Design an enzyme around this catalytic site. Sequence first.
Site, PDB file in Angstrom:
ATOM      1  N   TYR A   1      -1.855  -0.933  10.241  1.00 27.64           N
ATOM      2  CA  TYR A   1      -2.007  -1.286   8.833  1.00 27.64           C
ATOM      3  C   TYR A   1      -0.770  -0.855   8.055  1.00 27.64           C
ATOM      4  O   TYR A   1      -0.196  -1.631   7.307  1.00 27.64           O
ATOM      5  CB  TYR A   1      -3.271  -0.640   8.267  1.00 27.64           C
ATOM      6  CG  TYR A   1      -3.460  -0.864   6.790  1.00 27.64           C
ATOM      7  CD1 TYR A   1      -3.806  -2.118   6.294  1.00 27.64           C
ATOM      8  CD2 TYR A   1      -3.291   0.178   5.883  1.00 27.64           C
ATOM      9  CE1 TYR A   1      -3.993  -2.328   4.930  1.00 27.64           C
ATOM     10  CE2 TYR A   1      -3.469  -0.021   4.513  1.00 27.64           C
ATOM     11  CZ  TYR A   1      -3.831  -1.272   4.048  1.00 27.64           C
ATOM     12  OH  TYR A   1      -4.005  -1.504   2.696  1.00 27.64           O
TER      13      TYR A   1
ATOM     14  N   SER B   1       0.836  -1.197   0.000  1.00 29.90           N
ATOM     15  CA  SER B   1       0.000   0.000   0.000  1.00 29.90           C
ATOM     16  C   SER B   1       0.864   1.237   0.000  1.00 29.90           C
ATOM     17  O   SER B   1       2.006   1.189   0.459  1.00 29.90           O
ATOM     18  CB  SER B   1      -0.913   0.011   1.231  1.00 29.90           C
ATOM     19  OG  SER B   1      -1.617   1.232   1.339  1.00 29.90           O
TER      20      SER B   1
END
Lengths: 251, 233, 251, 233
Positions: A165, A151
């Site tokens: 995350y 990401s």
Amino acid sequence: LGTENLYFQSMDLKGKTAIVTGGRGDIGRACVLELAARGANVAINYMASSEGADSAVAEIKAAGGNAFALQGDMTKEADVAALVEKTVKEFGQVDTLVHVTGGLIARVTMSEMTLDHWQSVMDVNLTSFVLMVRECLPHMTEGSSIVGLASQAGRDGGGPGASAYGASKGALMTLTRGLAKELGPKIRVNSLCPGMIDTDFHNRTHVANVSPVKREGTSEDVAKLAVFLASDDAAFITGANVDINGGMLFS
Amino acid sequence: MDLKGKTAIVTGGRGDIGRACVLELAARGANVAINYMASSEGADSAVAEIKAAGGNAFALQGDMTKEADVAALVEKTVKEFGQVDTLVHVTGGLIARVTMSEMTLDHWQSVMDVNLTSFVLMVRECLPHMTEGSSIVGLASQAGRDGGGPGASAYGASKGALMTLTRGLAKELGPKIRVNSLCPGMIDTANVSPVKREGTSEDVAKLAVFLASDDAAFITGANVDINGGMLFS
Amino acid sequence: LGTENLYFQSMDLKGKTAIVTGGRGDIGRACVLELAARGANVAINYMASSEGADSAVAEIKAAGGNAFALQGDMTKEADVAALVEKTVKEFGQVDTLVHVTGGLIARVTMSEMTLDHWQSVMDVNLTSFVLMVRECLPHMTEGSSIVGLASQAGRDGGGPGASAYGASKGALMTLTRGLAKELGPKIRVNSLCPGMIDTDFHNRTHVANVSPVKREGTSEDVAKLAVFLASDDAAFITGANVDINGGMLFS
Amino acid sequence: MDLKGKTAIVTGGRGDIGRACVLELAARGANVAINYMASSEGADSAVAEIKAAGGNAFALQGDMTKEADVAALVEKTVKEFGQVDTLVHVTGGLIARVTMSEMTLDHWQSVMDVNLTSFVLMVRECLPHMTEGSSIVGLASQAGRDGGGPGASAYGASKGALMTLTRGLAKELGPKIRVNSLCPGMIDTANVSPVKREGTSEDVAKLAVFLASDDAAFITGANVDINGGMLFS
Ligand SMILES: [Mg+2]
Ligand SMILES: [Mg+2]
């Protein structure tokens, strides 16, 4: 025969077998279809609803290809083993892994952090990838490839309450590099670093507007990059973490 | 001595790089709370050296992967010294070399815990006690940037996570708290490198205390390479 | 019609026009052919011998495509203007620029540095790109793209005596980011960062051996990435500097 | 004062960040040779302040894009102070905002020259006179990492070149000479940033002198972000 040559050239993954985890979600299903469109057999993991996986299998079969789907939790060693075992029993080999299992889970600040939340985020994003790579290695061929889904959060820390995350995705980015060295030349390993993608799964207008491309990405955008990296067209690319974020971040 | 009146916690202060950080912090006047995991010899002699020079420090044995030990260290720090001005977290390690093909969950989790979970636990524990203008310094590695050495994939992954977390926390915790980490190369704890030597614990400590200090007030979210020119970012 | 659909899908650059500079060299000629293989009209710059450019034009025409070549020095404003003028006069538009002009020129240490050498390296690698982008902007369409050729040298400083070369490629990497912001959403801008590529033009066994992929890259490897980035398959990728180095360096 | 007996050249010492670097170097005992481009007021008052505190410095006007002026500065430094121990090159600037569509070669080259060619000229001139254990500090920018602001594409490009050159020279010139650069964000020469303020010249000078000093002996080829958490690398 001008056709036959075209078909031969377009179907460069014919005879090859892919596993996609997280066919469960938008990006995963798009990757499934992109792989099959170039001739790959596809084994599809999904976590919850089978709706999109079942329909992908049916579309692939109608177009003359081969695929199956299997429910499983990619954080569980038994489910990981079952998926790979059933893939090899069906197709006889594994040539590529595209691992789309992951997620934010919830927004939690560090001050309110729990080990339960931290562990859950690490496991769905990172441990699941570790398990799948380990499970696939006995079966991977000369010229095989692994594609992870990291990401933009790996590069900038992620958004509010997403520190776990971000951490898990930064770990995946580094691991991509470590495995590219450990597993090459037999296996290439690369990951994608997507920015804002319009999906069922992720969670806005700001970011679209602020972005140089003036829009959110699509699952199909991500799938095109994933399959490029999985394919022989990326044979000299390994250990890369490729930004696909509409120009919102540079590396 | 710009750290006079300020309070530092160093974890892993046993403890080559940790011990060097302890002395550098005390040399600039900081009170230092020192964690060590096992043998106390280096931590205790650091405490004695600091006290002999008119400073203040203590050493407490504990496992920084354990919530109770993390709580005990921070509680004692706040009782003896008051609020925490800086955290330098030197707990970490490779543990063992293992290829992915023979990876176990036990090993993977162990490496994550000693390098990353320990940092999470210490930051969480420190937050209620941190001062305005305080700082956190993590110990990442060149391995975070290049994946690490043979059989070190878990270690690299844990350090890459720490690098990203540094960025995430710099945003979440600013402006009250700065968060930076170090990315050391080969430390002696070579002649392929531009500097033609291994690094020392003291090299690393100098950077750690710079980043912990007000001299780095406009630096946050950085992962600073200290690798003798072996890798560039 | 199963054919016709295949042909339609495979020729995604049909109706589009590309300029490739440095069709002069291996990577450039490979890019030319990769662009034409997907239907692009191609205008080809070369600096010295026309042999590879002429043969590329002939191959493209024999396969039913369209291309021309033109000698020019891309460090010269007049030659840059002539190339773009002749491209638009021939094809009516410019949709993509792939700029393969560049080079080390010579190995010179900083202690022995001359302004002549420094300037020459900056001009062939960086100024040439500035000139071509400037010249193309009045003609670029919605959905246009620019692909630069940077180097692993931009990320690690380059090899012995190559400090000017590294500097020019690092400048190009940054400029890619600046232009992605300035020119988006209309135009995407990306560059490639190749490692060791086996070509006429670049300048060894070490590096092949030390590399995770255990080989040098090819011009075709680089062309595949260049055309991916030029195409709509990379529509959510802009400002990227993509490493293609066989795993010798990670970013 | 660890820089006692050592000699520093600061270019652009007129000169917000440059002037701050001059004083920080002298505060640690360095002799300082100061270049300034135009007005001498800040350079001269720095010299007077340094001398009043028992130090040594001089200020010389010159254009660091000109070979003759570069030579004059280094020659005078070596005659008055002896060999060069550190170079901090603060010459640079955006010059003007211009889009690529309306770019001129004149402007492009001007921006390259003041930011990059000037650094090349100063490093080349200094090399024969640099000591064992010496250092070079360049002034890059956050713009090198993100391309820069509106109309600043040339400026960004020049700083990106400087970042890469830093790496190239760290390899070429090591182990004798370390080479590092700074990548400042918004300097006041804001509340979107994690630190919720603009940086100061003094912030930048503290990092510059750290990197110039022996406290950074295992750091070379680094491009250190000092941007208040606005960008991460
Ligand atoms: Mg304060
Ligand atoms: Mg010395």
